[PDB]
Design a protein around this ligand. Structure first.
Ligand SMILES: [Ca+2]
Ligand SMILES: [Ca+2]
Ligand SMILES: [Ca+2]
Ligand SMILES: [Ca+2]
Lengths: 139, 18
């Protein structure tokens, strides 16, 4: 585990932990998922936490979060996640689309932060992220 | 906005999303 990987997990955690209290609640999870166009029920949110809630305190701490993400790591689930970003449906995630998703998530990005994110997944160097690229990234 | 010790990853953001 590298230093940059930890900083990414730390930011991924911060995106959920809206009030920055060090834990992720079912409420925070729902807010994020709705902001990405999903609509989990209360039961589903509780189930998500329960699966990784080692200490049974009802909320997710940093390690439990890491476990959640490691368990997350078919075609349909990936396609769906692609469509969260590919808003116009043209088959390419642009920088403007990525920035739009991050902004709905309450995260403001500099053009450089966004470009850097595209750069990470863009394999062919067209400056966009196609489905295959998005699959190589997620897989 | 750049935050020291923090880094925005597309990958982890993907998994974070469905
Ligand atoms: Ca919180
Ligand atoms: Ca817990
Ligand atoms: Ca697009
Ligand atoms: Ca590309």
């Amino acid at each position: 585990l590298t230093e940059e990987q930890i900083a990414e997990f730390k930011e991924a955690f911060s995106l959920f932990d809206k009030d920055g209290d060090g834990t992720i609640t079912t409420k925070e999870l729902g807010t994020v998922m709705r902001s990405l166009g999903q609509n989990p029920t209360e039961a589903e949110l509780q189930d998500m936490i329960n699966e990784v809630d080692a200490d049974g305190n009802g909320t997710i701490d940093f390690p439990e979060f890491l476990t959640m993400m490691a368990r997350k790591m078919s075609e349909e689930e990936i396609r769906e996640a692609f469509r969260v970003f590919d808003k116009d449906g043209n088959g390419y995630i642009s920088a403007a689309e990525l920035r739009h998703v991050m902004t709905n998530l309450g995260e403001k990005l500099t053009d450089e932060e966004v470009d850097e994110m595209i750069r990470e997944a863009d394999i062919d160097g067209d400056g966009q992220v196609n489905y295959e690229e998005f699959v190589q990234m997620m897989t | 906005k750049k935050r020291f010790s923090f880094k925005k990853s597309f990958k982890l953001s993907g998994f974070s999303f469905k």
